[PDB]
Amino acid sequence: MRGIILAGGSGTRLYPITMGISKQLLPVYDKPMIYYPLTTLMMAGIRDIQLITTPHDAPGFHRLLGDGAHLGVNISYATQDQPDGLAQAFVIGANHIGADSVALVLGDNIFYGPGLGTSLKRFQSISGGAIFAYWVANPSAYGVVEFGGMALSLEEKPVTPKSNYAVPGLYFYDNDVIEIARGLKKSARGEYEITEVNQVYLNQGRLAVEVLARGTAWLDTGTFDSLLDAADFVRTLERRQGLKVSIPEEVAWRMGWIDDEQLVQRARALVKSGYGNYLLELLE
Amino acid sequence: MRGIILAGGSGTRLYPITMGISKQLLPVYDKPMIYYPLTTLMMAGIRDIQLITTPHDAPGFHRLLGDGAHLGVNISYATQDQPDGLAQAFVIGANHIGADSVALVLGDNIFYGPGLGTSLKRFQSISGGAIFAYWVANPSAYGVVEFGALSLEEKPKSNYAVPGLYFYDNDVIEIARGLKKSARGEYEITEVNQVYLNQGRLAVEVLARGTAWLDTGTFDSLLDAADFVRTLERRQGLKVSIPEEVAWRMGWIDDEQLVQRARALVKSGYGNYLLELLE
Amino acid sequence: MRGIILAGGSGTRLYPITMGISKQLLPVYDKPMIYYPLTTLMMAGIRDIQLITTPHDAPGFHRLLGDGAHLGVNISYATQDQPDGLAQAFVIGANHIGADSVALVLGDNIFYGPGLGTSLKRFQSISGGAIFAYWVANPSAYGVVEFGMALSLEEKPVTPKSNYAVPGLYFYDNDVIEIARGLKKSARGEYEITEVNQVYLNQGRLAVEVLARGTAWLDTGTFDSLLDAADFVRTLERRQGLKVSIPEEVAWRMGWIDDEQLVQRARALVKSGYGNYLLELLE
Amino acid sequence: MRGIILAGGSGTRLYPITMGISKQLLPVYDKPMIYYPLTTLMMAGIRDIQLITTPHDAPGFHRLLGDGAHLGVNISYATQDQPDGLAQAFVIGANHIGADSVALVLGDNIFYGPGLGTSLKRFQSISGGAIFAYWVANPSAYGVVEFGAEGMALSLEEKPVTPKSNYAVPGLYFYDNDVIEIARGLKKSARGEYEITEVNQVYLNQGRLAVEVLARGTAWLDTGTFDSLLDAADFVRTLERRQGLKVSIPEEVAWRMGWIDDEQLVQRARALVKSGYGNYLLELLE
Ligand SMILES: Cc1cn([C@H]2C[C@H](O)[C@@H](COP(=O)(O)OP(=O)(O)O[C@H]3O[C@H](CO)[C@@H](O)[C@H](O)[C@H]3O)O2)c(=O)[nH]c1=O
Ligand SMILES: Cc1cn([C@H]2C[C@H](O)[C@@H](COP(=O)(O)OP(=O)(O)O[C@H]3O[C@H](CO)[C@@H](O)[C@H](O)[C@H]3O)O2)c(=O)[nH]c1=O
Ligand SMILES: Cc1cn([C@H]2C[C@H](O)[C@@H](COP(=O)(O)OP(=O)(O)O[C@H]3O[C@H](CO)[C@@H](O)[C@H](O)[C@H]3O)O2)c(=O)[nH]c1=O
Ligand SMILES: Cc1cn([C@H]2C[C@H](O)[C@@H](COP(=O)(O)OP(=O)(O)O[C@H]3O[C@H](CO)[C@@H](O)[C@H](O)[C@H]3O)O2)c(=O)[nH]c1=O
Ligand SMILES: Cc1cn([C@H]2C[C@H](O)[C@@H](COP(=O)(O)OP(=O)(O)O[C@H]3O[C@H](CO)[C@@H](O)[C@H](O)[C@H]3O)O2)c(=O)[nH]c1=O
Ligand SMILES: Cc1cn([C@H]2C[C@H](O)[C@@H](COP(=O)(O)OP(=O)(O)O)O2)c(=O)[nH]c1=O
Ligand SMILES: Cc1cn([C@H]2C[C@H](O)[C@@H](COP(=O)(O)OP(=O)(O)O)O2)c(=O)[nH]c1=O
Ligand SMILES: Cc1cn([C@H]2C[C@H](O)[C@@H](COP(=O)(O)OP(=O)(O)O)O2)c(=O)[nH]c1=O
Ligand SMILES: [Cl-]
Ligand SMILES: [Mg+2]
Ligand SMILES: [Mg+2]
Ligand SMILES: [Mg+2]
Ligand SMILES: [Mg+2]
Ligand SMILES: [Mg+2]
Ligand code: NA
């Protein structure tokens, strides 16, 4: 299975913060935003990960991640000329995907909790599509899945939502998604829609939908309030429960993709922020 | 008076966040970090403002700020190739400063409260230097002033921090030049202040009771800053350091310009506050 | 002008917290809830303050506040046998008020900012009624005032005519007692403060002021609003070095207690940190 | 095994808050403080629970908890004349404990996370004593346990000026029946109190103190200062807002244990309608 992080977009909902910088390079407490979706792929067992970025923001990502060898992975890059839809991930990313299955994660999404770690490897064998559902108070802000207990309908940002279940930005597909995505026309709102990709899998009878487990947090960081709330959550997990979450150096180390020497290496550079100290303790 | 914002630095206390974004382009709730020291200069009535940035981050600043004209100011850019210390502000910015007095603000500082708004205009006339003091529990983390003004020491003989806002007459260009490095290895703003102190030409004001001064340079201090700004909006209905507001209140842009900035920033909710300013 | 704090009620919106203890004895960061409305009355210059409580919660209040002498005021008590509504403050409190004007503050309310400190003494000379207005995003939760000047007043409207809540601070001349005595129970089953205000509005004798820009107003009667309030107060201290609604400070600033008395208060409260602030006042 | 919650104390470190309310009746977000230690005992499988309070604070606890039957538990109420120390729990509570083992939990403590739920029942068979350890930045502020080279407990000190480790000893203790006589033999410490640390020292010196470092990802909190109380409330709200969990809900535990049935749970939900807390109970039934 190959991994893609959609990390472009104009970030208009964060202006003026994102006039000067990509949403995906914004801090969430103690690490760049892009670290969270990066680690979600890594935890699913994926080592070949492509970022799709705008042309103008790519150098930021290159400066931050290079080719990902320091994290035990192969990170590569592709460019999206304008932000004309999430379903373009599979078109732009088709070379990267090859003949494999794919996991797409959105660059502004944070997944945390039971079932959202190393157990995501269960999706590597995907046949058809697999997507998720997460109860929210305001479903009209998201893609929405309606159940009957199987999935019944999907709608992007419905003015009259048919459930309270948002569809988070993590999607697993077999290789058929490339042809599905290539065949899509632009929606009314001007975009190649991931919700329409999911519709085709649904029509065929091979969309699986799983409600995220009790105790899971899912966050989209695309508003001033949700970005700040995400940071507070991550800090709270460290201060109260002693956990640093989505630390790619740790995940790479726990998966065996880098050794102790390398871990120490990464830690030394990050000593002064406090981030590198966390890394050191993992050893002792 | 001309304005300089130091907005370079390596940001090593924020790694890895600052491996991919400048500290001065960090979000602090509803706006980027640079907006805070920028609006502090604008409130002092300063329209000639040079950002010193690193070569690599400069593009982000440009995309955000351009030439300033939309905020009714003249934003100019200079490069500092290496973060060799704060006093390089004056050497690097000397063509900018010219024959004028100068306000230097640090790119990662927030000033909020009594006496830190449009009353700052009074410093335009500065002769000598003028700096500030602010009580803090952890005086070691900052530069430090003792009163009888008595001693300055960069990182205690008191609990008074010297925050990152400094006003100098034209002499500072020469004084910065006539310096040579500290034990860690930087040209320190603290030494400039020492020089002015030595001639008996440094004024120091304790910031007013109830002022907030913040430095966003660590994971906790940044997040605490963000939280503070949001708290001001949710609890007190105040949006702070909005440059379009300051410019509009100063007469530097007009109603229809304001309405344009607002339309451009409508999706995030930031523009809606600018529209409310008219109603 | 005399003062009343309504500090009874059942606290159902905080159950099961308030199955133990009164809402008005809950912490907000560094002090009991009741200190905020108490200090409001004090900043208005009022020294004769009656607390109305339930019968069962009274001992908590007596333990905390006693007769108020340590704060340079006279705190007295009355009980409300059932929580039959806010306007009963003026019936229960009739003897306390006597012939005087009165300020009523609700026990779960925090007022902070410009115009909400010692400048409140300007209301002592009230003729008629004077109430306030504060923009909230969710007006249906509160008393609501519509402007055109005040056009209408409605208690928790399903379709609010404005975003302006009517906060729990009210100043009235002596006529309020008879107005309250004449009320019947609303559809809700309570003698409503909103109806008292309606009577003054009917008579053209209700003044309404929108709270100043930069003011905070809070009602702490939900889990979220209680916790939000605590976070706000701690933020003021951590970020701006302010401790707010400290009654010892207010009393000392009014001349009601002296330096040596302030020291005694500080000494009583030193293990928590609260007393250290009081010592820092002296310098 | 019997349970005791120590819920007295003067609460001086929270004055003036605790001049008007017991620390153990303070709000922690959506429930009183006392519900956390109570639910800890219940999750250990303990239904016979003694609450020790001050005499003046007792009525508030009775108003809250009544006879405990709504939670499927039996509540014995005791009072402590003066706050003379933690080990007095076993003297006051001697009749309550009888011949059984006992769990003691401190009224101002919150335990959350792996190993601190229903798996606590593993301590009912305790022989000797069993206590815990939790890394803190400021161990001076707590009882402190030092481990030897072989990883076993080596020393215990209450609030040492020079801590020998960073491991605080949290306020949850499991003991066999010998604890009563041990506690009976104690003299007041240099703080003037009958200390829990001295009880634990007796068992350690006897070679029968077991100490477990709390599992990775656990939260342990003491709510006895303005900042720790507020931090605790923030934590509990974040778990709901972000992870969709309400924690230490004793009605839920009683219902999961089979101590109350569906109709009883609804009855509790109905008493708790206006706050949101009851609505959570209704959601459990689905
Ligand atoms: C439209 C577009 C977006 N992006 C990036 C930016 C974000 O990291 C990510 C998703 O864009 P956003 O504008 O944040 O999308 P958002 O409104 O949050 O909605 C999406 O994300 C939601 C979950 O966060 C889903 O429930 C929706 O079904 C899905 O459409 O993709 C691209 O890289 N290219 C694009 O063309
Ligand atoms: C290993 C590791 C994990 N995490 C995060 C990822 C998740 O949000 C959270 C839990 O991840 P993991 O511990 O790998 O466990 P998870 O994927 O939930 O799998 C567990 O939970 C599943 C569902 O209960 C079980 O079926 C599995 O057997 C069990 O291993 O911790 C980090 O942030 N950093 C890490 O290094
Ligand atoms: C060294 C250096 C820094 N910078 C930028 C980064 C920051 O915006 C600002 C100050 O750099 P920082 O490393 O944050 O400095 P910091 O440790 O906070 O200390 C300074 O700022 C403190 C106030 O925050 C003062 O109390 C100290 O006296 C002063 O030394 O200048 C530059 O643009 N160029 C530079 O060469
Ligand atoms: C009904 C009743 C309440 N009380 C106490 C409890 C509270 O401290 C205070 C107010 O009662 P609460 O139930 O919070 O009222 P609440 O729903 O917030 O609304 C009141 O207060 C709101 C402002 O907080 C106003 O906007 C409303 O017009 C007013 O009716 O009075 C009494 O002492 N006796 C009572 O009969
Ligand atoms: C002295 C005393 C206290 N209490 C109650 C109040 C609290 O809920 C609980 C503990 O008293 P506190 O004064 O908070 O104790 P505290 O300083 O936190 O320290 C205790 O609890 C700490 C854990 O929170 C331990 O690490 C210490 O070893 C232990 O002595 O017992 C009583 O019921 N009776 C008492 O005599
Ligand atoms: C005028 C103005 C002030 N402020 C801030 C600056 C100060 O921190 C605070 C008070 O400033 P100001 O009202 O200008 O007061 P002063 O006369 O004390 O200088 O409000 C803004 O954030 N935006 C604005 O448009
Ligand atoms: C004097 C004083 C005011 N305050 C609060 C009350 C108000 O919320 C705010 C300002 O009050 P104050 O300075 O008295 O101003 P005003 O003249 O505007 O009424 O500070 C305290 O908390 N403690 C005090 O001792
Ligand atoms: C069963 C249950 C557990 N919990 C809490 C207790 C613990 O802090 C955490 C885990 O408890 P539990 O799931 O019982 O697991 P363990 O087997 O690790 O003991 O969840 C509740 O808050 N409510 C509940 O109803
Ligand atoms: Cl109430
Ligand atoms: Mg998004
Ligand atoms: Mg700094
Ligand atoms: Mg109320
Ligand atoms: Mg018995
Ligand atoms: Mg304690
Ligand atoms: Na037994």
Coordinates of C-alpha atoms in Angstrom, one line a residue, chain A residues 112 134 215-217 233 236-237 240-241, chain D residues 29 36 110 112-113 219 232-248:
Chain A
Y112 CA -5.8 9.9 17.9
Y134 CA -17.3 10.3 13.6
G215 CA -12.3 7.2 23.0
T216 CA -10.9 8.4 19.7
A217 CA -10.3 12.0 18.9
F233 CA -5.5 18.8 23.2
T236 CA -3.1 18.2 27.6
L237 CA -2.2 14.7 26.6
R240 CA -1.7 15.0 32.1
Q241 CA -1.0 11.6 30.6
Chain D
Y29 CA -16.0 19.8 35.4
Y36 CA -13.6 10.2 41.4
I110 CA -8.1 11.4 40.4
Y112 CA -7.5 7.8 35.0
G113 CA -6.3 5.4 32.4
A219 CA -3.2 10.5 34.5
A232 CA -8.0 18.7 36.6
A233 CA -11.3 20.2 35.5
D234 CA -9.8 21.2 32.1
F235 CA -8.5 17.7 31.7
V236 CA -11.8 16.1 32.3
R237 CA -13.6 18.5 29.9
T238 CA -11.0 17.8 27.2
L239 CA -11.6 14.0 27.5
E240 CA -15.2 14.7 26.7
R241 CA -14.8 17.4 24.1
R242 CA -12.0 15.7 22.2
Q243 CA -12.4 11.9 22.9
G244 CA -16.1 11.8 23.6
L245 CA -15.6 10.2 27.1
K246 CA -17.2 10.9 30.4
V247 CA -15.0 9.4 33.1
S248 CA -15.5 8.3 36.7

